[PDB]
Design a protein around this nucleic acid. Sequence first.
DNA 1: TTCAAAAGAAGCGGAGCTTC
Length: 1095
Amino acid sequence: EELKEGIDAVYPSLVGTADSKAEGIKNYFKLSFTLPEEQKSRTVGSEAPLKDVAQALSSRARYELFTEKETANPAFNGEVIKRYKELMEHGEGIADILRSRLAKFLNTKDVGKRFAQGTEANRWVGGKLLNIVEQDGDTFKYNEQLLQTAVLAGLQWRLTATSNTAIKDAKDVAAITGIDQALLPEGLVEQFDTGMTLTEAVSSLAQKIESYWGLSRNPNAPLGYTKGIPTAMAAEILAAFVESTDVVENIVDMSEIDPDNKKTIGLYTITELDSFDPINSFPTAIEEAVLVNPTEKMFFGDDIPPVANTQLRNPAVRNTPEQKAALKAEQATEFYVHTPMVQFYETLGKDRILELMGAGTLNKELLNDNHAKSLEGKNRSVEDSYNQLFSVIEQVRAQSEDISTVPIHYAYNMTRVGRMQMLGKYNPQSAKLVREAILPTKATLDLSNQNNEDFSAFQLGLAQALDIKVHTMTREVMSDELTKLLEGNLKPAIDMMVEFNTTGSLPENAVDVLNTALGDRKSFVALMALMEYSRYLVAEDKSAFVTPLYVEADGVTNGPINAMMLMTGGLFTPDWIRNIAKGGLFIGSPNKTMNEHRSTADNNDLYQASTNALMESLGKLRSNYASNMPIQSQIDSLLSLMDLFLPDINLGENGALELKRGIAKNPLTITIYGSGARGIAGKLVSSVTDAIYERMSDVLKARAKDPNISAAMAMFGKQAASEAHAEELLARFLKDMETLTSTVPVKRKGVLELQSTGTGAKGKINPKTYTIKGEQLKALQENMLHFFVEPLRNGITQTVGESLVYSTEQLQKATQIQSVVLEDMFKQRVQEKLAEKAKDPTWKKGDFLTQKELNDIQASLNNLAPMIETGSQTFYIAGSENAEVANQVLATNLDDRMRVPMSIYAPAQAGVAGIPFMTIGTGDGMMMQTLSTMKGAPKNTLKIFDGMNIGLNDITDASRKANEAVYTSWQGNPIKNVYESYAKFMKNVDFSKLSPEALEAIGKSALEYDQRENATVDDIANAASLIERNLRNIALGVDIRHKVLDKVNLSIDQMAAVGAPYQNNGKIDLSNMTPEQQADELNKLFREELEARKQ
DNA sequence: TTCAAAAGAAGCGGAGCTTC
Ligand SMILES: Nc1nc2c(ncn2[C@@H]2O[C@H](COP(=O)(O)O)[C@@H](OP(=O)(O)OC[C@H]3O[C@@H](n4cnc5c(N)ncnc54)[C@H](O)[C@@H]3O)[C@H]2O)c(=O)[nH]1
Ligand SMILES: [Mn+2]
């Protein structure tokens, strides 16, 4: 009751009665919200928020008074104050648009007159804003406090939303657009990553608006109003921004991108401010005024980010104590601007940085259309990073006279998969350009003697930055390779940088000099290396040289290796010992390092081993079809085409096939994580078509530079030796493209057969519009699938071990089955409650359920063990936010458009998510979390998931701790964790209660293709409990292996580069033994440990 | 079926079916 009259005192004039049982118009704003116990927003109570905040922003003194702080961010100066004054005036224009739009709505279809007569329009999907209007003579008007506060939220969102949007990948776009991921057109993914979907824009706006309103949700009010009213407000604000042209709306017709797709999709992009707009130096003034506890802000000095209580976008999952400890540790690290790189970036200038690191200026007619779109996407990313960096620098520069002395902190959160992610799009963790200007690494080195350990550290940092693969060679060999480079190709660049570090000037051909010197080594960190070595050369005191140059301790094929260690469940095999050594687990070799292994024992890493296995599987494939000439020809053409355009595939003069580890890197990784072969085939083809489109721009360029040039020379000039030698390359290309688009392999009854597509590639090539589309793309993909990817998959399995593949399958099925039941039961418990609501006369279809009701439903699922617990991490595989549960609109704008589906936090099918969740989570996730919290945890590093940047002073000890953290994570047992959860599930699940849809989904996972079709609940049930037994057995094995492995002498250098391996000090000595001998000895220990328990 | 975040628009009518 105190709450009712409390919220009424604040909004006494809103239309309707604050009682859900009342007969006439009811006010769902006061029913849905209460005043907080403690102030959240300084606009609560204000009769004119826009006037008050504008006043607050009008001077430093007034701002300080308003926020009740004694001092304001020094970035808030005259120039910035003047810009905010102009932005407040614009807030008035947004407010004015909103008021007119309301008046239009009230007048159309006499909604206002009807509402006044008792028609409950304030409950319509388009009428929820009527809960915040006030009667005004013969009509209605917005409550000014609520209206103007939402506008302030709208201005803040307008300033910073773009910079906080999620990144879209091909997967996201395919889901959005309904177009198969493998067939997405060029630049479509780019078009979609640039804008916001309606849901994306509205939900971020709504969150901000509700935040500024500064109220609390009533647990017993229907979500249709608690979420609905601020969403209706957001929708209206987005619409006003479209009217004001602060936001551009683009309705994308899928019909032209695919004749059969009927979706039309809205894209919303915020009009960018000028890069030199003063407000960029301090874009959060409003947020920091309105909110008592601002979320959008920079953390300078000893202003430390708070620790997140719950997993990112998974509010049902609390960050564990150990996770919070890790977050705290990472949020405490101080970052500092490295002034020389900033000055270098600035002196080069945005345009030359793009020429150097992007695609420079685009001549949209020396470029193939499709290529042109990738180039644009490239520039976008570098340009945004540049602009974002310098906005941050502008704000840092205000904090002090020496920007290199201003400490900077970053907020972090744990993601769904256990990774510690730095919040924001453009920060050191996520943006390479920013990574080289803002660093937590720093050291003072004695470089007066090139025989110091300090100089050796310095060399290692330069080499790694320069794309020398420092983990494949010893420190000594590295040193000689680096010296060769600095005295050879890099010298002209080094000389230029010496000059720059002397006078502060660059030549006009700087881009050329860098580009030529670096060649393929070019990167932002390479620039840091040139900068730092040249700074050392001109340094006055080489004996105390200060530098943020770092060495990254980086995982060697980290995910696959972790999966092999964590989820291989059988006896030990020699192949496993050899392969796992490729990832830094050395048995019976005290103090062995990855550098030594690679140089003296085995130069092939796990990607190369898989690639070599691929070549065998391919050789086998060729045999089974040896007499079938058309099939041999089809394979040769695929191999030929890839050879023309991909560096990783080489065909020799006499036909010798050679493959670089590169083509196996991504396919190995994602295959373990549950990717299908088709998806991989599609990716390989993309890399082929990308290269082709690019070669077409080469044609246009060479052809324009010389109209005489022959087609062959224009397309294979750079790639060939002679004229006629380029004429055969052209012949291969045209033959390959034709056979690969007109003929596809299919698998009928275990055998491959060629079929005509009837849609072969035909016609003269026009290098500008040339596009491999639809039916042609699919054909290329089918060829790639059967003649390359399928043998690759065979190679992968032989490499990582069939035992691991088996474990990931049981893990996948268990977590899928569980997610299906969870999803289905949730939806059912929801439909039950809504049927109870039709009995309620206070309730209307569209109101949905209360939070309290949703909470009770979620709690009722606890006996199905939705959460996986390791003791230090919590995983919620099924957790999601979906439109499928409520299946209805939440709100629209006042024009009956911008219809936002009602989204609910609820479990959904996992699919294959179980694998990467557990592998990433208990692998690199657990390693980094351990690294942050362990005794003697390395200080002043930047952690990037499976690699860690270390200052040059501490590379040895930090690397050793990193490898100890790896070993610690290898004591994990993610299958055991899944088993514990799945066995509780199996004890409580009622398969008979599931919908038939749920039931068949489970059949797919638990039952062979055959026994499905028409199996009973009991067949499903019995099959589901077999998986539990499988899990139990795997988990037992994993546990034994780990204990046995711990008894033996191990050297671990998975976090490689520095050559500082962790020794487990196992007492049983397996040195001077072959992998076969070692496997036998480990299997004895395994059997003996299996008996300790059996008895 | 790789993971790390979801996600059509809009007339009529007042939800939800319909057509593009
Ligand atoms: N889950 C995931 N992680 C990704 C993906 N792309 C990149 N990452 C992570 O970021 C670094 C690279 O950051 P950068 O700014 O230096 O480029 C990357 O390191 P690695 O390339 O060495 O891979 C380490 C482990 O990450 C997982 N992983 C990589 N790539 C993928 C993909 N495509 N899909 C799933 N998982 C991936 C593996 O466990 C790998 O061993 C990553 O740490 C990304 O798309 N997804
Ligand atoms: Mn790595």
